[PDB]
Design a protein around this ligand. Structure first.
Ligand SMILES: CCn1nnc2c(C)c([C@@H](CC(=O)O)c3cc(C)c4c(c3)CN(C(=O)c3ccccc3)CC4)ccc21
Ligand SMILES: CCn1nnc2c(C)c([C@@H](CC(=O)O)c3cc(C)c4c(c3)CN(C(=O)c3ccccc3)CC4)ccc21
Length: 285
C-alpha cells in the first residue's frame, strides 16, 4: 500500500522526524531521521524515492536557510545526500514533472526568490529555469497536466492571492486567475482536474477556508472549510481524497489530520500525528 510520509517540520525548533501514515489501517510508522533537522522544507517523490528539499535549520551556532536536497529510500530506510540547489530556499514549494523536481521560490535571509530550478535525478544536477513573475516564499506548488502551478505566498511585503503557471515546453511563466483569498503557507494540491488551496495565513489570521481552481473554467470557487484553521500545513492526495497534516493556528502547533471527500464536500478528522508540528514536507508513495 502507498503511505503518506511527513518529513521535518517545526515544534519549538526544526525537527528531524520522518514518519509514514497508512490510510488502509490508520497506523503510523517512525522511520530514519533526517540527517539535519529542517522546517520549511518540501517533500516529493520520484521513482519511489522521497526527496526533502530546502528549509531551515536551528543550531546552537545560529539558524541557517538550507540549499539541501536529500533522498530517502523506503526499501533500505536510508537517507543519502544529493547535489544542493544553487541557493538556500527556506519556505520553498516543489513539484514534479516528467521525473524532474522543480524547486520554486523560498527565501535566503532577506532575499525572497523569484528564481526556480530543476533537478534531474539521473544526473544529480540542478539548473535554473525561467524565474517566476512574482517573488514568493511560503508558496504552494502543484502539478496538473504537466504544468507547474505556484499559488499564493509572500513577496517580501504582501501576502498574495495571485498564482502563476509554468509551461516547461515554453520555459515561461504566466499568471493564472487570482484566488478569492490572500494565502501564504497554504496547502496546495491537485485532485480531479482542480488545484486546491487549503488554509494559510493572510497576515492577520490562519484560515480554515478552502478554494479550488477548475482548470477548464479557470475559476476559483470555495468548497467546505476545514474543521481547524491552519497555516504552514502539510498536504497530499491519496485515493481521491485530500489529507491535510498539522500546521499552526496562532495558538498551537496542530497534530490534527483532516481528510476531504470531494463527492460529499466534507472534511473529517482521520488520525492525529504523533506530535504537533508545522512546516513539514509531505508526499505519498
Ligand atoms: C523568517 C524565517 N523563518 N522561517 N521559519 C522561521 C521560524 C520557524 C522561526 C521560529 C523561531 C526561530 O527558529 O528563529 C518561530 C516562529 C514563530 C512564529 C514562533 C516560534 C518560533 C515559537 N513559538 C512557539 O513555540 C509557540 C507558539 C504558540 C504557542 C506557544 C509557543 C511562537 C511562534 C523564525 C523565523 C523563521
Ligand atoms: C506567526 C503568524 N503566522 N502564522 N502563520 C504564518 C505563516 C504561514 C507565515 C508564512 C510566511 C509569511 O507569510 O510571511 C510561512 C509559510 C511557511 C510555509 C512556513 C513558515 C511561515 C514558517 N514555518 C513554520 O513551520 C511556522 C509557521 C508558523 C508558526 C511557526 C512556525 C515553516 C513554513 C508567516 C507568519 C505566520
Amino acid at each position: 500500500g502507498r503511505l503518506i510520509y511527513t518529513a521535518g517540520g517545526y515544534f519549538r525548533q526544526s525537527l528531524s522526524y520522518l514518519e509514514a501514515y497508512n490510510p488502509s489501517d490508520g497506523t503510523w510508522l517512525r522511520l530514519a531521521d533526517l540527517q539535519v533537522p529542517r522546517s520549511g522544507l518540501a517533500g516529493c517523490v520520484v521513482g519511489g524515492l522521497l526527496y526533502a528539499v530546502g528549509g531551515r535549520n536551528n543550531s546552537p551556532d545560529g539558524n541557517t536557510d538550507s540549499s539541501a536536497l536529500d533522498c530517502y529510500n523506503p526499501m533500505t530506510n536510508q537517507w543519502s545526500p544529493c547535489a544542493p540547489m544553487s541557493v538556500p530556499r527556506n519556505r520553498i514549494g516543489v513539484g514534479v514533472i516528467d521525473g524532474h523536481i522543480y524547486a520554486v521560490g523560498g527565501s535566503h535571509g532577506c532575499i525572497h526568490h523569484n528564481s526556480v530550478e530543476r533537478y534531474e535525478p539521473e544526473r544529480d544536477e540542478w539548473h535554473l529555469v525561467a524565474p517566476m513573475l512574482t517573488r514568493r516564499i511560503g508558496v504552494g506548488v502543484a502539478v496538473l497536466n504537466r504544468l507547474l502551478y505556484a499559488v499564493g505566498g509572500f513577496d517580501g511585503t504582501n501576502r498574495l492571492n495571485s498564482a502563476e503557471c509554468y509551461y516547461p515546453e515554453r520555459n515561461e511563466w504566466r499568471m493564472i486567475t487570482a484566488m478569492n483569498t490572500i494565502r501564504s503557507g497554504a496547502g496546495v494540491c491537485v485532485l480531479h482536474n482542480c488545484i486546491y488551496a487549503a488554509g494559510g495565513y493572510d497576515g492577520q489570521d490562519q484560515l480554515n477556508s478552502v478554494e479550488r481552481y477548475d482548470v477548464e473554467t479557470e475559476t476559483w470557487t470555495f468548497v467546505a472549510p476545514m474543521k481547524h484553521r491552519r497555516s504552514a500545513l502539510g498536504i497530499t492526495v491519496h485515493q481521491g481524497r485530500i489529507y491535510v497534516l498539522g500546521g499552526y493556528d496562532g495558538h498551537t502547533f496542530l497534530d490534527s489530520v483532516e481528510c476531504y471527500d470531494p463527492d460529499t464536500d466534507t472534511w473529517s478528522e482521520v488520525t492525529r500525528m504523533t506530535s504537533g508540528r508545522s512546516g513539514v514536507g509531505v508526499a505519498v508513495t
